[model samples]
Target: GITGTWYNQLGSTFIVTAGADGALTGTYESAVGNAESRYVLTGRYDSAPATDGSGTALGWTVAWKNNYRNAHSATTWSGQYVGGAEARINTQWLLTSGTTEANAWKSTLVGHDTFTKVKP
Candidate 1:
């Protein structure tokens, strides 16, 4: 799973935005991260909450995420989105990985050996 909500560009290539359904969408960019070869997510904001919490409705985030993700082990992301009041401008990322599962992971090396991933 963990397919979308990220974008990337490698060497001289452009960017790719991950759709809400974990699919790639939007235009590609040739800057940031790497700017040559086709790239994927190297790190990303996995399931991070985007909120103003004021109930003004001026900011909105539409997103879709794969069922599993590793927020610590070099995360990745891809997507096309707009932020703020007018919903203008577009952005992209540079590097990204394919996908991975964040489940039943015990990192004794990081002192999180007793951590558990509880699904909602």
Candidate 2:
């Protein structure tokens, strides 16, 4: 059910394709830094229904192919899919960067996003 193009609050977008065996693959295009590139997306969609029973649980990760200000990073998103009138994915994301431990606190960023399906 998580097979569609989704646009997030930050204007970023991703397309997801779900497999029978719960494998997920997609392409993520960022709205900010490295806006011109599309990163590979890989993750999983749980077969079991979400706790709310509206949809399913899923998680995805995108490894940045380009450096941001000379630092490499990857982002992981964990969320639940909710369908119906307001089809969307509610997610919390963590961005981990390859930086010195002293700047680790600033390098690791956390955020939330609500991704809605793009109209056909």
Candidate 3:
């Protein structure tokens, strides 16, 4: 399952490519009109899925989620979280469009946080 997502700010771009192997690759490029900055960010599931499979998210062992704080500093990205909990479960880990946009048009993210599974 390849979920290709990106954020477009003027000319810069941020994208994520996921494959069936339970692996993911991401890129962040935040731009302002003619100026821009680029960075490569990557992450993978910490361990084997709870479903006891080779590859395939039968149960959420946490894949990855967007650091919307870096993109939508003004918007309520945390509210959009599936769990409705401040420290919510990633669910399926997604990267949304327009995430590369911010007030100063900077290189992206407020404090892009990485996450793991819920203890409960």
Candidate 4:
């Protein structure tokens, strides 16, 4: 349902493609610029029942990260997407293991990003 190229206020871009089976996959290319050490995310997507008892699907987890950083310094993302004209979700991009991003580099958690679909 929620799948497509999504952008944020900072103009950073994320492209998500989720299938009917609730399997998620996508890429997040941080837009601080390509010249610097930008973060590129590529990985699988998953979902679960929201613990809030709303009877709605509200739980999601993303296992993703960049190339070099992903090697022991992998990341696990947990957040939920809300429905709107284009749908929105805020996520905490957490490190699954290893050391987190340094101050000179991009933070693993890009914070809550608002994504808008360009298509189905």
Best by TM-score: 2
Q: What is the per-residue lDDT of model 2 for residues 3-100, given as tens digits with 9 covering 90 to 100?
A: 87998977688888988889889888876455556788999988766566566888999988744432388999999888887798999999998888
**Which scores better on TM-score, 2 or 3?**
2
Error of 4 at 46 (Å): 6.9
Clashes of each: 29, 0, 3, 1
Instruction: Give residue 63's error in model 4 in angstroms.
Output: 7.5
Root mean square deviation (Cα) for candidate 4: 6.6
State each model's CA lDDT, in order.
Answer: 0.27, 0.82, 0.35, 0.52
Model 1 residue 38 lDDT score: 26
lDDT of 4 by residue, 1-120 (tens): 457766666666666677666666666655445533345444444445456623223333434344444444555555666665656655555554445556535535444544555422
Pairs that collide, model 2: none
Q: Output the lDDT of residue 48, model 1.
A: 38
Off by over 4 Å in 1: 1-13, 17-37, 53-82, 85-120
- Estimate the overall C-alpha local distance difference test score of candidate 1: 0.27
For model 2, the stretches where C-alpha displacement exceeds 4 angstroms are: 32-35, 50-54, 66-71
| Winner of 1 and 4 under TM-score | 4
Evaluate model 1: give its TM-score: 0.21
How far does residue 88 in candidate 2 sit from its true spot (Å)?
A: 0.5
TM-score of model number 3: 0.31
lDDT measured at residue 14 in model 4 versus the true structure, 0 to 100: 65
